[PDB]
Paper text:
Cathepsin L (CTSL) and calpain-1 (CAPN1) are host cysteine proteases which play crucial roles in coronaviral entrance into cells and infection-related immune response. Here, for the first time, two peptidomimetic α-ketoamide compounds, 14a and 14b, were developed as potent dual inhibitors targeting both host CTSL and CAPN1 with IC50 values at low nanomolar level based on structure-based drug design. Meanwhile, 14a and 14b also showed weak inhibitory activity against SARS-CoV-2 Mpro with IC50 values at micromolar levels. Interestingly, the crystal structures showed that compound 14b occupies the S1, S2, S4, and S1′ subsites of SARS-CoV-2 Mpro, while 14a occupies the S1, S2, S4 subsites and the extended sub-pocket close to the S2 subsite. These structural data lay the foundation for structure-based design of multitarget inhibitors that simultaneously target host and viral proteins.
A fluorescence resonance energy transfer (FRET)-based cleavage assay was used to evaluate their enzymatic inhibitory activity against human CTSL, and the results showed that 14a and 14b exhibited potent inhibitory activity against human CTSL with IC50 values of 3.34 nM and 6.88 nM, respectively. To elucidate the mechanism underlying the potent inhibition of human CTSL by 14a and 14b, the crystal structures of human CTSL in complex with these two compounds were solved at 2.4 Å and 2.9 Å resolution, respectively. C25 from domain I and H163 from domain II constitute a catalytic dyad at the substrate-binding site. Apart from covalent interaction, four hydrogen bonds can be identified in the complex structure. At S1 subsite, the hydroxyl group of this thiohemiketal forms one hydrogen bond with the Nδ atom of H163. Additionally, the amide oxygen of the α-ketoamide warhead interacts with the Nε2 atom of Q19 through a hydrogen bond. As expected, the deep hydrophobic S2 subsite, which is formed by the side chains of L69, M70, A135, and M161 and the main chains of M161, D162, H163, and G164, was occupied by the 4-fluorophenyl group at P2 through extensive hydrophobic interactions. In addition, the NH group at the P2 site plays a crucial role in inhibitor recognition by forming one hydrogen bond with the backbone carbonyl oxygen of G68.
Numbering used by the authors: 1 to 220
The structure:
């Protein structure tokens, strides 16, 4: 496995988005993973619709702006046999009735793979598959104020994640050893948060914040 991976510089990652005041972290996390896999499959990088996921994934168990799972979004894409593009079904940060139009479908998947809960497998999956959809514990106030460096909430939980985010790679900082490894994580709170909307999560520090607890990716 390589020592550093960054899927942004290879063209797998859409620009950073802003979810607003609606609990659709899962939707954005699912669309990023599916964008990565669609690009790997065809070489075409198309922003997908979070609103479609929010509005139409009800039957699969999701709760719109009131919570959602990324596996449930992949299941909705598979059952629905399609996912509209961001441009056709633009984000409105609210719950609305499903307006899916198969004419504007630009993505689909045949299921999803759940990663074993250990950071080594997460590293392997990120290296070989691409951006991976994950969950982390971000309820602590420190996460709200992140700016740069490796983020390390001493009170983070490894088994109770509440935020879905995407992992676009991993790397290390050139310091004198002292466990410098980090996960490159993309967030959905815009660009003015963290490093242009990104965060370096602590890597190989005993599954800090349960990043490797709920890792999965859609199979196209
Ligand atoms: C999410 O991190 C977020 O969007 N935060 C910003 C925000 C804006 C407005 C209001 C609140 C937060 C957050 C969103 C939920 C729902 C909205 C209300 N409060 C929240 O905390 N997290 C999730 O939505 C979460 C993501 C997740 C996925 C996978 C995993 F292993 C852990 C977490 N999913 C749920 O909370 C959830 C999912 C389901 C599915 C079925 C029934 C109930 C569910 O609850």
């Amino acid at each position: 496995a390589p020592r550093s991976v960054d899927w942004r510089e290879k063209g797998y990652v859409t620009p950073v988005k802003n979810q607003g005041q609606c609990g659709s972290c899962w939707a954005f996390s699912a669309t990023g993973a599916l964008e990565g896999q669609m690009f790997r499959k065809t070489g075409r990088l198309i922003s997908l619709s979070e609103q479609n996921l929010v509005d139409c994934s009800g039957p699969q168990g999701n709760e719109g702006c009131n919570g959602g799972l990324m596996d449930y979004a992949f299941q909705y894409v598979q059952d629905n046999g399609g996912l509209d593009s961001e441009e056709s079904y633009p984000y409105e940060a609210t719950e609305e009735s499903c307006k899916y139009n198969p004419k504007y479908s630009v993505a689909n998947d045949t299921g999803f793979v759940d990663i074993p809960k250990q950071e080594k497998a997460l590293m392997k999956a990120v290296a070989t598959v691409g951006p991976i959809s994950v969950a982390i514990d971000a309820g602590h106030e420190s996460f709200l104020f992140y700016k740069e460096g490796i983020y390390f909430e001493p009170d983070c939980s490894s088994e109770d994640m509440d935020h879905g985010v995407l992992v676009v790679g991993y790397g290390f900082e050139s310091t004198e050893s002292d466990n410098n490894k980090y996960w490159l994580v993309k967030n959905s709170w815009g660009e003015e948060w963290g490093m242009g909307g990104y965060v370096k999560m602590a890597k190989d520090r005993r599954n800090h914040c349960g990043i490797a607890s709920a890792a999965s990716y859609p199979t196209v």
